[PDB]
RNA sequence: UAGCGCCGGCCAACUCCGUGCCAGCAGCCGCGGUAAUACGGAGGGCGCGAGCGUUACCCGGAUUCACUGGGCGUAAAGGGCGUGUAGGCGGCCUGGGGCGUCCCAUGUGAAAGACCACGGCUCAACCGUGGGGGAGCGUGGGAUACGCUCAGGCUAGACGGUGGGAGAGGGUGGUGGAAUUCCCGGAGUAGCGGUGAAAUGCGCAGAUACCGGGAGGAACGCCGAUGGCGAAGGCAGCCACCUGGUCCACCCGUGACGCUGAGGCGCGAAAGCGUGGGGAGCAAACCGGAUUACCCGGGUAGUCCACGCCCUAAACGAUGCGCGCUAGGUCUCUGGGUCUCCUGGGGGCCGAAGCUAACGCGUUAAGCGCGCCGCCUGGGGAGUACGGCCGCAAGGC
RNA sequence: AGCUGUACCGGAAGGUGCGGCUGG
């Protein structure tokens, strides 16, 4: 059974990006929409769009890749090198303001579900709040 | 179109052979064959000819590869109608990565060609002459046309990217731009400038190579 | 006043003499059996220095118990397989409560120690003054994205309804033929059988080969396949009855009713055991013949049935179960359609991305992820010892 | 060609019976 939707969405994105697909589809929800939004501003994905497949609402994600490379293995570079799930069902990770992680010395982002919405580490630190540590992307 | 259509350019291979990465250049399937989209052919052809024409004016050279049975004559004829080198008998392992070693063979060819033009061959008993002549003819067979390359080429022209995969790999390794006349069973990623057309059908090869050579001619 | 340990590699620091598998050194790998930079001495050298080495114990190195931060196809490691209790975990939309969660304020969090800044002993060790930090709890207030709970809905999971399909799936009855053996009758005579070649054996009380009748037991040739079914073990003559699982179409009904599962309960090839039958062929042990096993001729258990035990394996795909995503090509079994083709479910080969120590795996994953269970921690001793549970016993856990 | 569960071995440098596996 589908136990974790968010991990599923992240895995869908990773699998799509590893084979340089221009677009992926994921079952739609508000929470996934928030994650996609946060990803959208930071310029990881090209952009998300709400669509309907057989009446079932889906989110279609348009992905982003670097320029075509030169020499052997001409496959273009990735914009999302690495994406993980931190807080999983059966082990939830909650962090205070002090304990908010720094990813790749500020190159990468971490997504927090704070009491004041879904934010990045930078936004959370500015607002001085913590919460559930969803994922880290770089 | 209107020249490509009647040349059998759009006639691809069957569904048993096609590479999925090529699906973007496919229009439709008919009667157990894959049809290659021709508007995409036009666009890619325009782009590749722009590149070729720029390279021709700049002063670089293009090595005409292709060793398919029905492509050899066309390759030779189109290449000789230019200063461009060509390979149409066999692609020796390391014509590009091992350029210095093959250049020694080129020098051996030139020295032997000079020797048989000399009356000094009357020594070295007749059977030694026989082995020398065999060596010379082997060298001419495999290295005629390749003699024009004084150094590494500036681009490569491959008739069938799948067939001459070794040449494609070498060129990739040495940062040499690749131009190829691909079909349904080819990998679009490995070709820098692709002309989605036919690798068989003499007519298609004739048309494409003729146009390219004429463009090179008027570009000079 | 200047000692102490080292000088093969780890590990900074090299020559001579003495000995010759001796005497000896050793933390590991290892040196010494004649020219030893490894033993003993000398000269030099290196490292510390009123200290320098050794033994014992703790942390590190050890990511070598892996929460940070490991693993199980072949290196140690997927339970023999189901059903399922406790537990763990759990789709989409809206509202309430603020339990977890986050934040602010405040009370604690003794001194000494630790940290920072100044000082006093001629410096330091030591000590003094001041400031801050601090995991964790108590009280007050706030937020509601996520997890929880309570309500109201939804159909994408799950389960039903209707119509149809394939199958060595299981149990109980019942009959069909081929073949071996044996008994009776007929006809016919000197070998038959067996081996690499022979022997033991059977046969003049008539064997072998042949024909006819009868008795009994066990297994089902051709189709038969790289096939099909089942959770595994495993399942082939045919007919009937009873019965389990599963696939497809319609997309009609319920509206999260789900996944996994320590114990428990059930099933579990073969070989064995008990109580009664049965016994044709084959055949452990055993008895003879050739030539150490092998091979040949006999032969008890056993193989078969009923009931009750036993519970093991190369019980294997050496790969736990469920769900989602990630190019394809080809062969095949079985449904549906708008039947060149398209769309489901099984079984096989070759291969994208990727993974792997490699072999290889690759939509039937050993790829990328989530949930739950089992198991591993160097080899031998050892599945041994003792203890406990089970078994008639062998033995099993 | 080996290996393996089980059961025997008064011509065990190991053999045989009934099954299983390819790790031939």
Curated annotation (Swiss-Prot), chain A:
One of its GO terms (molecular function) is rRNA binding. Disulfide bonds: none annotated. It comes from the Bacteria. Pfam families: Ribosomal_S8. GO terms for biological process: translation. The keyword Transit peptide does not apply. Keywords: Ribonucleoprotein, Ribosomal protein, RNA-binding, rRNA-binding. One of its GO terms (cellular component) is ribosome. Belongs to the universal ribosomal protein uS8 family. Part of the 30S ribosomal subunit. Contacts proteins S2, S5 and S12. One of the primary rRNA binding proteins, it binds directly to 16S rRNA where it helps nucleate assembly of the platform of the 30S subunit central domain. The combined cluster of proteins S8, S12 and S17 appears to hold together the shoulder and platform of the 30S subunit. This is Small ribosomal subunit protein uS8. It comes from Thermus thermophilus (strain ATCC 27634 / DSM 579 / HB8).
Swiss-Prot record, chain B:
PROSITE patterns: RIBOSOMAL_S2_1. Transmembrane segments: none annotated. SUPFAM superfamilies: Ribosomal protein S2 (SSF52313). The keyword Transferase does not apply. The keyword Magnesium does not apply. It comes from the Bacteria. GO terms for biological process: translation. GO terms for molecular function: rRNA binding; structural constituent of ribosome. Pfam families: Ribosomal_S2 (PF00318). Belongs to the universal ribosomal protein uS2 family. Part of the 30S ribosomal subunit. Contacts protein S8 and may contact the N-terminus of Era. This is Small ribosomal subunit protein uS2. It comes from Thermus thermophilus (strain ATCC 27634 / DSM 579 / HB8). The lineage of its organism: Bacteria, Thermotogati, Deinococcota, Deinococci, Thermales.
């Amino acid at each position: 059974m589908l136990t974790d939707p968010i991990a599923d969405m992240l895995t869908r994105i990773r699998n799509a990006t590893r084979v340089y697909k221009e677009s992926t589809d994921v079952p739609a929800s508000r929470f996934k929409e928030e994650i996609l939004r946060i990803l959208a501003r930071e310029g990881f994905i090209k952009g998300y769009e709400r669509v309907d497949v057989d009446g079932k609402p889906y989110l279609r994600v348009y992905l982003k890749y670097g320029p075509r490379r030169q020499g052997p293995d001409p496959r273009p570079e990735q914009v999302i090198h690495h994406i993980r799930r931190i807080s999983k069902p059966g082990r939830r990770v909650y962090v205070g303001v002090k304990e908010i992680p720094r990813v790749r010395r500020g190159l990468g982002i971490a997504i927090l579900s704070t009491s004041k919405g879904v934010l990045t580490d930078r936004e959370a630190r500015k607002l001085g709040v913590g919460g559930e540590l969803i994922c880290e992307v770089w | 179109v209107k020249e490509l259509l009647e040349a059998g350019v759009h006639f691809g291979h069957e569904r048993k052979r096609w590479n999925p990465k090529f699906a973007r250049y496919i229009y439709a399937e008919r009667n157990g064959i894959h049809i290659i989209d021709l508007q995409k052919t036009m666009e890619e052809l325009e782009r590749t000819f722009r590149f070729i024409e720029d390279l021709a004016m700049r002063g670089g050279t293009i090595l005409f590869v292709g060793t398919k049975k029905q492509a050899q004559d066309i390759v030779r004829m189109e290449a000789e109608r230019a200063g461009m080198p060509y390979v149409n008998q066999r692609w020796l392992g390391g014509m590009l990565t091992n350029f210095k070693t093959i250049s020694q063979r080129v020098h051996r060819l030139e020295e032997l060609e000079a020797l048989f033009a000399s009356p000094e061959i009357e020594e070295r008993p007749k059977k030694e002459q026989v082995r020398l002549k065999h060596e010379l003819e082997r060298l001419q067979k495999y290295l005629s046309g390749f003699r024009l390359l004084k150094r590494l080429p500036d681009a490569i022209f491959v008739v069938d990217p799948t067939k001459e995969a070794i040449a494609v790999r070498e060129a990739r390794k040495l940062f040499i731009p690749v131009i190829a006349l691909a079909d349904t069973d080819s990998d679009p990623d490995l070709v820098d400038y692709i002309i989605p057309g036919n690798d068989d059908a003499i007519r298609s090869i004739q048309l494409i190579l003729s146009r390219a050579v004429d463009l090179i001619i008027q570009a000079r």
